[PDB]
Design an enzyme around this catalytic site. Structure first.
Site, PDB file in Angstrom:
ATOM      1  N   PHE A   1      -8.333  -6.513   3.278  1.00  0.00           N
ATOM      2  CA  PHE A   1      -7.843  -5.211   3.378  1.00  0.00           C
ATOM      3  C   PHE A   1      -8.138  -4.597   2.012  1.00  0.00           C
ATOM      4  CE2 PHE A   1      -5.007  -2.192   6.027  1.00  0.00           C
ATOM      5  CZ  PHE A   1      -4.951  -1.495   5.003  1.00  0.00           C
TER       6      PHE A   1
ATOM      7  N   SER B   1     -12.188 -20.241  -5.612  1.00  0.00           N
ATOM      8  CA  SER B   1     -10.822 -20.048  -4.930  1.00  0.00           C
ATOM      9  C   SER B   1     -10.696 -20.533  -3.716  1.00  0.00           C
ATOM     10  CB  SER B   1     -10.205 -18.779  -5.161  1.00  0.00           C
ATOM     11  OG  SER B   1     -10.152 -18.131  -6.333  1.00  0.00           O
TER      12      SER B   1
ATOM     13  N   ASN C   1      -7.189 -20.076 -10.405  1.00  0.00           N
ATOM     14  CA  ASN C   1      -8.436 -19.358 -10.401  1.00  0.00           C
ATOM     15  C   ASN C   1      -8.348 -18.126  -9.802  1.00  0.00           C
ATOM     16  OD1 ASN C   1     -11.082 -19.215  -8.563  1.00  0.00           O
ATOM     17  ND2 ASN C   1     -11.478 -20.531 -10.219  1.00  0.00           N
TER      18      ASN C   1
ATOM     19  N   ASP D   1      -6.583   6.558  -4.731  1.00  0.00           N
ATOM     20  CA  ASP D   1      -6.065   5.028  -5.014  1.00  0.00           C
ATOM     21  C   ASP D   1      -6.136   4.850  -6.254  1.00  0.00           C
ATOM     22  OD1 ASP D   1      -8.534   4.265  -5.384  1.00  0.00           O
ATOM     23  OD2 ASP D   1      -8.720   3.011  -3.551  1.00  0.00           O
TER      24      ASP D   1
ATOM     25  N   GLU E   1       0.843  -1.349  -0.045  1.00  0.00           N
ATOM     26  CA  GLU E   1      -0.192   0.239   0.061  1.00  0.00           C
ATOM     27  C   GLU E   1       0.742   1.349  -0.064  1.00  0.00           C
ATOM     28  OE1 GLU E   1      -3.085  -0.184  -0.368  1.00  0.00           O
ATOM     29  OE2 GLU E   1      -3.851  -1.868   0.041  1.00  0.00           O
TER      30      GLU E   1
ATOM     31  N   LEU F   1      -8.821   3.935   2.818  1.00  0.00           N
ATOM     32  CA  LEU F   1      -9.615   4.491   2.022  1.00  0.00           C
ATOM     33  C   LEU F   1     -10.587   5.566   2.870  1.00  0.00           C
ATOM     34  CD1 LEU F   1     -11.649   4.843  -0.654  1.00  0.00           C
ATOM     35  CD2 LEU F   1     -13.094   3.354   0.740  1.00  0.00           C
TER      36      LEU F   1
END
Ligand SMILES: [Cl-]
Ligand SMILES: [Cl-]
Length: 162
Positions: A104, A117, A132, A20, A11, A32
């Site tokens: 996250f 998955s 996948n 972002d 990040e 965010l």
């Protein structure tokens, strides 16, 4: 290596409000603020999150504080999610970190939607899960980060982060 260091790598850290990869107002370590297009709305949410008039700028300490809360919230969302919890509990610690990273980034809801998955990871079919997971918008939009997380689930090691 641990979840914090891993996500700090994925990040980055910015002390001024920024947009972002999806164009949303964010600050700190991937915190965010709002999906709204209004910078004011963002500054508003920021001040509310920090507890002071920030004028869109925070300190490192403040960033780290939001970050810790956000990690905590991610884990806690996972543990409260009927689809995620069982997966998480079945994994080793390195792979749990990969699951947290995804949550996250995309929210619990977002991740809980990777049904297939998830089932593959639960079954420990690493290579298949990796294939996948790659067939997703997530991978196509942020391929380098996705690759790192995917390698982490595939190998159970931190090699992608070294
Ligand atoms: Cl908050
Ligand atoms: Cl990326």
């Amino acid at each position: 290596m641990n979840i914090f260091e891993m996500l700090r790598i994925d990040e980055g850290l910015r002390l001024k409000i920024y947009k972002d990869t999806e164009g949303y107002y964010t600050i700190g370590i991937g915190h965010l603020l709002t999906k709204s297009p209004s910078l004011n709305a963002a500054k508003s949410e920021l001040d509310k999150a920090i507890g002071r008039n920030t004028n869109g700028v925070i300190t490192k300490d403040e960033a780290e504080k939001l970050f810790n809360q956000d990690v905590d919230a991610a884990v806690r969302g996972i543990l409260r999610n009927a689809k995620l919890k069982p997966v998480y509990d079945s994994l080793d610690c390195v792979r749990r970190a990969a699951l947290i990273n995804m949550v996250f980034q995309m929210g619990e809801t977002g991740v809980a939607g990777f049904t297939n998955s998830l089932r593959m990871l639960q079954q420990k079919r690493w290579d298949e899960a990796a294939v996948n997971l790659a067939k997703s918008r997530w991978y196509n939009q942020t391929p380098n980060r996705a690759k790192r997380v995917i390698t982490t689930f595939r190998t159970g090691t931190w090699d992608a982060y070294k």
